[PDB]
Amino acid sequence: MDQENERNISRLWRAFRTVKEMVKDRGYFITQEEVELPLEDFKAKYCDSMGRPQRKMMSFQANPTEESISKFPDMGSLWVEFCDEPSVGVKTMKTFVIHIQEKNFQTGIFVYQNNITPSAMKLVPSIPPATIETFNEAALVVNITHHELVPKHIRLSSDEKRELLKRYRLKESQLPRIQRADPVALYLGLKRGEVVKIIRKSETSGRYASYRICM
Amino acid sequence: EIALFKYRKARLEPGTAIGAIGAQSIGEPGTQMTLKTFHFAGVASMNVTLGVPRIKEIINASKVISTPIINAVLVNDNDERAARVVKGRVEKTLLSDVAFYVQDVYKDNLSFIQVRIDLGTIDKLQLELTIEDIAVAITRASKLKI
Amino acid sequence: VKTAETGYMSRRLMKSLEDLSCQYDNTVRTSANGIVQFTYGGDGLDPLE
Amino acid sequence: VRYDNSGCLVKREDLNKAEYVDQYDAERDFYHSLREYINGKATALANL
Amino acid sequence: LPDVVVKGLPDISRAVINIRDDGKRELLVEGYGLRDVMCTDGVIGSRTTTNHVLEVFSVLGIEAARYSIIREINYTMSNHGMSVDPRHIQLLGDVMTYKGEVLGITRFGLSKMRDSVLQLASFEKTTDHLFDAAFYMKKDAVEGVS
Amino acid sequence: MLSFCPSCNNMLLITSGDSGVYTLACRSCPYEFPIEGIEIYDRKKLPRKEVDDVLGGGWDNVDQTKTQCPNYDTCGGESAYFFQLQIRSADEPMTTFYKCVNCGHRWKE
Amino acid sequence: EKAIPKDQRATTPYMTKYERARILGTRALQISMNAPVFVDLEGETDPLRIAMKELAEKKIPLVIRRYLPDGSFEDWSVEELIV
DNA sequence: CGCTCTGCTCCTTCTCCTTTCCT
DNA sequence: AGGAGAAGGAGCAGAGCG
Numbered sequence A: 001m002d003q004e005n006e007r008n009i010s011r012l013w014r015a016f017r018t019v020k021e022m023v024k025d026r027g028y029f030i031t032q033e034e035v036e037l038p039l040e041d042f043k044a045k046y047c048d049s050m051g052r053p054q055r056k057m058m059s060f061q062a063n064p065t066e067e068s069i070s071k072f073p074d075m076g077s078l079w080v081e082f083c084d085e086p087s088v089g090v091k092t093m094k095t096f097v098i099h100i101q102e103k104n105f106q107t108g109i110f111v112y113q114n115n116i117t118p119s120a121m122k123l124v125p126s127i128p129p130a131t132i133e134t135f136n137e138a139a140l141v142v143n144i145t146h147h148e149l150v151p152k153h154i155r156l157s158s159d160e161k162r163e164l165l166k167r168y169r170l171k172e173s174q175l176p177r178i179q180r181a182d183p184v185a186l187y188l189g190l191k192r193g194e195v196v197k198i199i200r201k202s203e204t205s206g207r208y209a210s211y212r213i214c215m
Numbered sequence B: 001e002i003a004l005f006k007y008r009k010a011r012l013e014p015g016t017a018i019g020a021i022g023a024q025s026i027g028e029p030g031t032q033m034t035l036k037t038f039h040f041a042g043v044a045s046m047n048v049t050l051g052v053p054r055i056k057e058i059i060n061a062s063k064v065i066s067t068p069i070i071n072a073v074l075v076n077d078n079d080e081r082a083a084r085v086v087k088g089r090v091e092k093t094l095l096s097d098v099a100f101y102v103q104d105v106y107k108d109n110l111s112f113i114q115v116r117i118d119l120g121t122i123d124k125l126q127l128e129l130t131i132e133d134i135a136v137a138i139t140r141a142s143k144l145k146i
Numbered sequence C: 001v002k003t004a005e006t007g008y009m010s011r012r013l014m015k016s017l018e019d020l021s022c023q024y025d026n027t028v029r030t031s032a033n034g035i036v037q038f039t040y041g042g043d044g045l046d047p048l049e
Numbered sequence D: 001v002r003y004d005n006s007g008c009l010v011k012r013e014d015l016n017k018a019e020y021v022d023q024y025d026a027e028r029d030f031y032h033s034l035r036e037y038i039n040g041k042a043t044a045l046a047n048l
Numbered sequence E: 001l002p003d004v005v006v007k008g009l010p011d012i013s014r015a016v017i018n019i020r021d022d023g024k025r026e027l028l029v030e031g032y033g034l035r036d037v038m039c040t041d042g043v044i045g046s047r048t049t050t051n052h053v054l055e056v057f058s059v060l061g062i063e064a065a066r067y068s069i070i071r072e073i074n075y076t077m078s079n080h081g082m083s084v085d086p087r088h089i090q091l092l093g094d095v096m097t098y099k100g101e102v103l104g105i106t107r108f109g110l111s112k113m114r115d116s117v118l119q120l121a122s123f124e125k126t127t128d129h130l131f132d133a134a135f136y137m138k139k140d141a142v143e144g145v146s
Numbered sequence F: 001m002l003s004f005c006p007s008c009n010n011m012l013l014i015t016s017g018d019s020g021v022y023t024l025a026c027r028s029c030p031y032e033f034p035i036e037g038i039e040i041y042d043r044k045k046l047p048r049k050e051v052d053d054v055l056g057g058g059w060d061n062v063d064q065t066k067t068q069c070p071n072y073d074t075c076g077g078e079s080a081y082f083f084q085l086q087i088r089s090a091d092e093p094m095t096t097f098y099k100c101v102n103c104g105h106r107w108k109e
Numbered sequence G: 001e002k003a004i005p006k007d008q009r010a011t012t013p014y015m016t017k018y019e020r021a022r023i024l025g026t027r028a029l030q031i032s033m034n035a036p037v038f039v040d041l042e043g044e045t046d047p048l049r050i051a052m053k054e055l056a057e058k059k060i061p062l063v064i065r066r067y068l069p070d071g072s073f074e075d076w077s078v079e080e081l082i083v
Numbered sequence H: 001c002g003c004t005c006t007g008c009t010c011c012t013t014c015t016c017c018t019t020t021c022c023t
Numbered sequence I: 001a002g003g004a005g006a007a008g009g010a011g012c013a014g015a016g017c018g
């Protein structure tokens, strides 16, 4: 349908913007005009002349910024890879893994569309140096970070985590924990043992800082 | 001096049994609330449970509660074709709500089921579906059922 | 009718919350030394006084 | 003093950045409200 | 046949438009379709909340669920006329969600971080806990008040 | 379809019998009906829906009394809604819940 | 395990209710088991009240060991802590 | 290409736990 | 009761096969 096509394109554009800003605030270089793209520009630049979207014009690459690489020296480039086939199987996932390994990236996300099989999920955690981050598309329409109920989570470096521990004379097993595969933890791409600083605001106490560790 | 003394005084002292203090400060008022959603007669608002059953659900972290409510904030302010156009996108099974009749038809070799989906009701309740959306939904239901 | 439910609720609330104490570093911790709050209520102020 | 997340000192232009918040922030807010109340009284006197 | 959704969300009972005290015209939804409602066109997705703390936990995270717990308790105990300090409820929320997930105040939830066979047996399912401690050689330390 | 066999009144069915005939079988007695020259159909009327209305609320026509809000210095409340529907014990007196008609503060006495 | 030195101590200098009650109870026990006192008795026999008088006159010979969660500690006396 | 494994996802049957005690 | 938890079934798209 025509309005169904319009709705699909609108949702795809919003998902593209969410992925763009998610890659931005993670510490990779994208620009404000690159993220603040208009809907007409999206349609005219990422769609064919027949009247449909095309996911393959959007698969892009990001690079670490200067300050981000200064803070976290061991951070490589990623590769966002939208997919066109609804139910992702082992064939598409195997091809994706081979492309990741041949392009020698350090990380790369995969924005599938409808469904991911249990067999494909088994190839996600099979690469020694690198890792892939499977993301749904219906999830990325509204980014979680901009919701009112979500306090500003901030990622801590190794130096900052060591500073936090030395201050309270703590051990990392004692800090409050944040689950891996938590909507805000996978948004920032949190690995095990990473400390995330939270700025939560209460009407009875103003702003105060709390902390969590990825578990 | 008065303000500084009072502020330096009001601080949680080390050794306080704050967990038990808070547990009793929550449980003790909890013994007075009725096991019922009492409310002032004459309003007949939406039904939500807000007594000790509600406290019990929150405390138990039950995966299924009674009367769950979503609060959706709109963008416009106009009763006609500003709130209904976005209410029409979040509703229940409207096939019998728009079907206006359903027929069972047999013939020499073919067996039919016919539905005459009138369009005036869709023209009134501002809905985004004409023909093929209904057909796709019916085919999805057929895949789901038979 | 509601008495029994309220009493059970108070008992399990106490079982969950019974061992939490402000420490001399001002943090609220557990018996196992697990730091649940870094400052009471984000303020460190006793609600009583 | 409001040190940095790594132990440095904030440069006095990054004081309210919502990333260097810590404890003592509620104490700072209390002092600010104290000074504001006294200023209200002083401004009323000057206006009279 | 006339019982299959043709539009909307097949997880939501009904929606009604409400006239706010400020004059705004907003509708609030009765069901479990949170993410779909946040994604629907015509609503503000950054301002949309639900009753279910567990729903908020699945889509928005654990800090959002802690905020939801605190607000829901404050509402349920503020509508009854009970005057409780907010810090008690803050501590309740922090304890309920301090291990990365929403653990309730039931016997199943109480196996969160207690790790104490003696106090778990004192609370409930005594023999099961003691026999499990005997099998797995649970080696608790005596630090808890129980 | 809901039709019944004459002379046995049991039930009529459509049969996947021989030579591709969807005739009106009985299964209880030897009774048959040729569909050829068809006019059979089953009409089921369906009420569609109505345009539903809002639920703003009617604080008007609700019990009112004359009391003072606890936070008078903020909002000036000289009236309040109430119900006398809380009774802890028989010897102990009743309890009355209020809510500020001005601001909306619930409390009990 | 070690002791936080006298020059740098980070704990409050205000005696707490728990510290006060414990100090009074311990001194009452010590007096009731026939220990010498350090205040003019006037007419009084109760070890608890003698201890309260000694606390008011600030003459109790005890110190408080405050234990931090890590395991170090600080030493505060009763003539230093104030109320 | 049906066949045939391997694996979910769904579902049904089966126990625990329920208030001050007041000597 | 209600109310969750948990252990075993039962049909089912998936994926590899000659």
Ligand SMILES: CCC[C@@H](C)[C@H]1CC[C@H]2[C@@H]3[C@H](O)C[C@@H]4C[C@H](O)CC[C@]4(C)[C@H]3C[C@H](O)[C@]12C
Binding pocket: B063, B064, E011, E032, E052, E054, E055, E058
């Ligand atoms: C109409 C009845 C449907 C009902 C049985 C289904 C439909 C939506 C489901 C919830 C959501 O998935 C979100 C949460 C996910 C968590 O993991 C577990 C809890 C959580 C609230 C779910 C519980 C349960 O599964 C629900 C209520």
Ligand SMILES: [Mg+2]
Binding pocket: F089, F091, F092
């Ligand atoms: Mg009486």
Ligand SMILES: [Zn+2]
Binding pocket: F005, F006, F007, F008, F009, F010, F026, F027, F028, F029, F030, F031
């Ligand atoms: Zn017959």
Ligand SMILES: [Zn+2]
Binding pocket: F069, F070, F071, F072, F075, F076, F077, F100, F102, F103, F104, F105
């Ligand atoms: Zn009022």
